[PDB]
Amino acid sequence: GLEEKKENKQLTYTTVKDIGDMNPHVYGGSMSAESMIYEPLVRNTKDGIKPLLAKKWDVSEDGKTYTFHLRDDVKFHDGTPFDADAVKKNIDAVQENKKLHSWLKISTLIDNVKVKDKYTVELNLKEAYQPALAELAMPRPYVFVSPKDFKNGTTKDGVKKFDGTGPFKLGEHKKDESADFNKNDQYWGEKSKLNKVQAKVMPAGETAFLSMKKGETNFAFTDDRGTDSLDKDSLKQLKDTGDYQVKRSQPMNTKMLVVNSGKKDNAVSDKTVRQAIGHMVNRDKIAKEILDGQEKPATQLFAKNVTDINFDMPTRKYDLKKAESLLDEAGWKDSDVRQKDGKNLEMAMYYDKGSSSQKEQAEYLQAEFKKMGIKLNINGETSDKIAERRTSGDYDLMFNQTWGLLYDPQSTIAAFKAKNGYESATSGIENKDKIYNSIDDAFKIQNGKERSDAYKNILKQIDDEGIFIPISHGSMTVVAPKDLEKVSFTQSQYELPFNEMQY
């Protein structure tokens, strides 16, 4: 059963959903699937940026000229050659649709692009952005689909077939059932060692645990929405059968409480209380006793594996006697409860109800807080009303996350001052205008060490503020056969090195 997929050198993984629109210049497809069959110009790796498809590249100073010298012998999956034009028509087509890509700064900061010869391509920016290469490195949108396939020279809207550059070719697609990714034999680089990777659509929990148990599936990894098909116990049981190993990646993000400097109605505008509460979230107890060792506790905003974050910056430790002074020191003072100017001390916490862990920790803090005289309202909502509640600034406290390894720290820092990021919380602070500019300017700084300290200085202030109280580090969890080796993680909560895996 499970042994017969080792003999065909094959992974069939359980997922909760169809792979979707495999157009990589649009946001329907499954991110992990798209990385199997398409490629960017440069790979972003745990250990910095590396070549791939663009063997070497120059960067000008004024910081607006990426010149990419392309590996030649790469070949599209239909049999169109890959050269320097193909890249230009790709990027143009993506950039015709700037509208839905404009969450990604490089899409905005672009002027145009031109082909220097059959294997050389210049990219020109409206202004400097050191991160460009990282955003270029994402499996969408900046990835390559054959000429033959466009629809009247366009891609957004749609594309004829899904021919890319990657180590796997796309085979049968049974909408909501199964999707076959078949070893590419005209792959240029590190060719796949598995013949096939198959997605097999089914629900999380019991039906997935069974499939896995019987070798109907034999692989499982966290999907592009953070959804994991097997729970804690179900993993032990898998492990327990002796046919499975379970791996976990480095941190892929930072789950955190967001605290609203912006709302003058509430004490939450007052810096003294923000820091008071910065000492009231027992990271370690929560991390072990609510999340059951499954995530590590997070003592700062971007863990040390995030690009350019080369520093410790331990945010405030759990300590209620430091917290209790700060609270008196901001006003809030018969029996155990707080009070300033008559109004008792209350806060409105919101969270996403579609995750139990968020409710459990939401409620755990209602307890901690009660004991200390404050009262929290704990209101679980649909992920959309949280997102919409974020932007509108309509909260005291609300759980949330960093964008993750693929995007960070660029995106989560930019987010500190974007309409639909945490601009709402950032706002209510002294030097907001300084800090907001430190940020625009930090992304320009080319010297790796300058930018690194740039970022350090920004975040020291934002930590100074207790806008964000970190709690834990989400990780991706992979379940693989015991005798499958070479399973690694990368700078992404979406991609895995299927080409590189082996029995």
89 and 8 in a common domain: yes
Q: Is 93 in a helix, a strand, or coil?
A: helix
Residues 199, 284: one domain? no
Separation CA 116–CA 85 (nearest Å): 9
CA distances from 37 to 23, 31, 42, 119, 141 (A): 11, 11, 15, 21, 13
Q: Is residue 409 helix, strand or coil?
A: coil
- From residue 338, how far is each of 208, 314, 324, 396 by CA, in Å? 49, 28, 10, 17
Evaluate whether 298 touches 472 at the Cβ level (below 8 Å). yes
**214 and 296 part of one domain:** no
Q: DSSP class of residue 381?
A: E
Residue in the structure block whose two tokens are 């999907």: 223
Whether 67 and 201 share a structural domain: yes
* CA-wise closest residue to 19 among 35, 39, 43: 35
Provide the 8-state DSSP code for 219.
Answer: B
Q: Are residues 168 and 45 in the same domain?
A: yes
Tell me the pairing of strands 397-401 and 244-251.
unpaired
What CATH number is given to the structural domain containing 121?
Answer: 3.40.190.10
- Strand 397-401, strand 196-201: pairing: unpaired
What is 431-456 written as a DSSP string? THHHHHHHHHHHTT--SHHHHHHHHH
> Looking at the structure, do residues 350 and 247 belong to the same domain, yes or no?
no
Distance in angstroms (rounded) separating the CA atoms of residues 411 and 482: 37
- DSSP letters of 113-149? EEEEETTEEEEE-SS--TTHHHHHTSSSSS----GGG
> Cα–Cα distance between 215 and 5 in angstroms, integer?
8
Residue 64 structure tokens: 């607006």
Q: Is 353 exposed, middle or buried (0-12, 13-18, 19+ CB in 10 A)?
A: middle
For residue 436, give every residue at least 6 positions away whose Cβ sits within 8 Å of its Cβ, in sequence order, or none: 416, 417, 426
Domain extent for 312: 252-474
Q: Report which secondary-structure segment, H or E, holds 470.
A: strand 468-473
Q: How many domains, the chain?
A: 2
- Do 246 and 262 reside in the same domain of the chain? no
Method of determination is X-ray
Q: In this structure, are 205 and 291 located in the same domain?
A: no
Residue 287 and residue 151 share a domain: no
Q: Is there a single domain that holds both residue 486 and residue 409?
A: no
Q: For the sheet containing 196-201, what is the strand order? A: 10-15, 196-201, 178-183, 168-174
- Are 266 and 192 in the same domain? no
What's the full length of the chain, in residues? 503
Maximum distance among all Cα pairs of the chain, rounded to whole angstroms: 82
Secondary element (H or E) of residue 359: helix 356-371
Are 209 and 335 in a shared domain?
no
Handedness of CA 206, 209, 214, 216 (dihedral sign): positive
Across 353-467, the runs of DSSP E, i.e. the strands, are 375-381, 397-401
Q: SS3 string of 151-205?
A: CCCCCCCCCCCCCCCCCEEEEEEECCCEEEEEECCCCCCCCCCCCEEEEEECCCC
